[PDB]
């Protein structure tokens, strides 16, 4: 479900739907999407479902807290 059609090349390459985010770089309760996203619109909207926040983290694995960045 997405992989970088919504995220930057590199380190914040991985799209996760997250609970919230803190400090501008830590994403929390991050689950990987439930649907391939192609843009921000489907990123923000596919995430919203869970009441979550679209982010681009350094890992593709779900995690309590991950070093993320907010999706564009
Ligand atoms: Zn949760
Ligand atoms: Zn779209």
UniProtKB/Swiss-Prot annotation:
Disulfide bond among keywords: yes
Keyword terms: Cell wall, Disulfide bond, Secreted, Signal
S-S pairs: 7-56, 17-47, 18-30, 57-68
Superkingdom of this protein's organism: Eukaryota
Principal subcellular localization: secreted
Localization (cell): Secreted, Cell wall; Secreted
Gene Ontology CC: one annotated term: extracellular region
Phenotypic effect of disruption: Leads to wettable and fluffy colonies. Results in thinner hyphae and impairs the formation of aerial hyphae.
Entry function: Aerial growth, conidiation, and dispersal of filamentous fungi in the environment rely upon a capability of their secreting small amphipathic proteins called hydrophobins (HPBs) with low sequence identity. Class I can self-assemble into an outermost layer of rodlet bundles on aerial cell surfaces, conferring cellular hydrophobicity that supports fungal growth, development and dispersal; whereas Class II form highly ordered films at water-air interfaces through intermolecular interactions but contribute nothing to the rodlet structure.
Family statement: Belongs to the cerato-ulmin hydrophobin family.
Quaternary structure and partners: Homotetramer. Further self-assembles to form highly ordered films at water-air interfaces through intermolecular interactions.
Name by which UniProt lists this protein: Class II hydrophobin 1
Organism: Hypocrea jecorina (Trichoderma reesei)
């Amino acid at each position: 479900n997405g992989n970088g059609n919504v995220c930057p090349p590199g380190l914040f390459s991985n799209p996760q739907c997250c609970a919230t985010q803190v400090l501008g770089l830590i994403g929390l309760d991050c689950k990987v999407p439930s649907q391939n996203v192609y843009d921000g619109t489907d990123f923000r909207n596919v995430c919203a479902k869970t009441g979550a926040q679209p982010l681009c983290c350094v890992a593709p694995v779900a995690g309590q807290a991950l070093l993320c960045q907010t999706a564009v």
